[PDB]
Design a binder for this molecule. Structure first.
Ligand SMILES: Nc1ncnc2c1ncn2[C@@H]1O[C@H](COP(=O)(O)OP(=O)(O)OP(=O)(O)O)[C@@H](O)[C@H]1O
Ligand code: NA
Length: 241
């Protein structure tokens, strides 16, 4: 029953406070959403949890252990993983090599197990037919599947998915949701942000809504979708699920 908690995170860039105050929690076995308008601070919040950027204030805690001082690699070894929003594939490496590149980092895997895991990931994500294709040759949706698989290959306890559905077709969204639910069933805590509101809320048990660097709402999917404030500020007053 691990718990990942962020308290009162803040970030400024060149005097502009882009994250004012964001707190959130994700438990093992739980899928949690972070949603909101563009420029609201979602990726910056993920960056601060993962350790990609230093926070200007706030705390990152796993269980009753403040890890705010741990560098990126140490937080990764404590169980935090991140799927970047931006392209993260190795352009010149094949799909197989891209997955092996991450599996090589796994102290908890033998050489034989790494090869097995690579082949399993390719089947689960339906990219076996692209085994030898270079990353730069993949379409956007194909690349995204590889990038999600790479993030899972790290075997995180808490996985932060930054826009896993971007550029993905509807059937592949269903496949990825099913994979996400299997991670949840397996004990992972999942923190997901995406602008496909319907499909993200369908897979979330609860979600935080941020706007202009601050939280404006938190609740179950239906509580969010019927929140008239969220409709006005984020979903649009005429939003239909
Ligand atoms: N390195 C930076 N320097 C200055 N400003 C930045 C920097 N990075 C981000 N910003 C600004 O911080 C604000 C929040 O950025 P962030 O990417 O975290 O928001 P977001 O919620 O993820 O947006 P989106 O939904 O469009 O992806 C933005 O307005 C951005 O212009
Ligand atoms: Na973003």
């Amino acid at each position: 029953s691990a718990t990942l908690t962020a308290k009162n995170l803040a970030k400024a860039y060149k005097g502009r406070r882009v994250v004012e105050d964001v707190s959130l929690t994700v438990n093992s076995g739980e899928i949690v959403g972070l949603l909101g308008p563009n420029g609201a601070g979602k990726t910056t919040t993920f960056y601060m949890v993962v350790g990609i950027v230093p926070r200007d204030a706030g705390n990152i805690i796993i269980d009753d252990d403040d890890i705010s001082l741990l560098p990126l690699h140490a937080r990764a070894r404590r169980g935090i993983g991140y799927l970047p929003q931006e392209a993260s594939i190795f352009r010149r490496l094949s799909v197989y090599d891209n997955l092996m590149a991450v599996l090589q980092i796994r102290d908890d895997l033998s050489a034989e197990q790494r090869e097995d895991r690579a082949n399993e990931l390719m089947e689960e994500f339906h990219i076996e037919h692209l085994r030898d294709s270079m990353g730069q040759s993949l379409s956007g949706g194909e690349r995204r599947r590889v990038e999600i698989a790479r993030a899972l290959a790290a075997n995180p306890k808490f996985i932060l998915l930054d826009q896993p559905f971007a550029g993905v077709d509807p059937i592949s969204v269903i496949d990825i949701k099913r994979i996400i639910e299997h991670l949840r069933d397996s004990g992972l805590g999942v923190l997901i942000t995406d602008h496909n509101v319907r499909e993200t809320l369908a897979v979330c048990e609860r979600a935080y809504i941020v706007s202009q660097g601050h939280l404006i709402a938190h609740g179950t999917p239906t509580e969010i979708l019927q929140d008239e404030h969220v409709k006005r500020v984020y979903l649009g007053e005429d939003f239909r699920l």
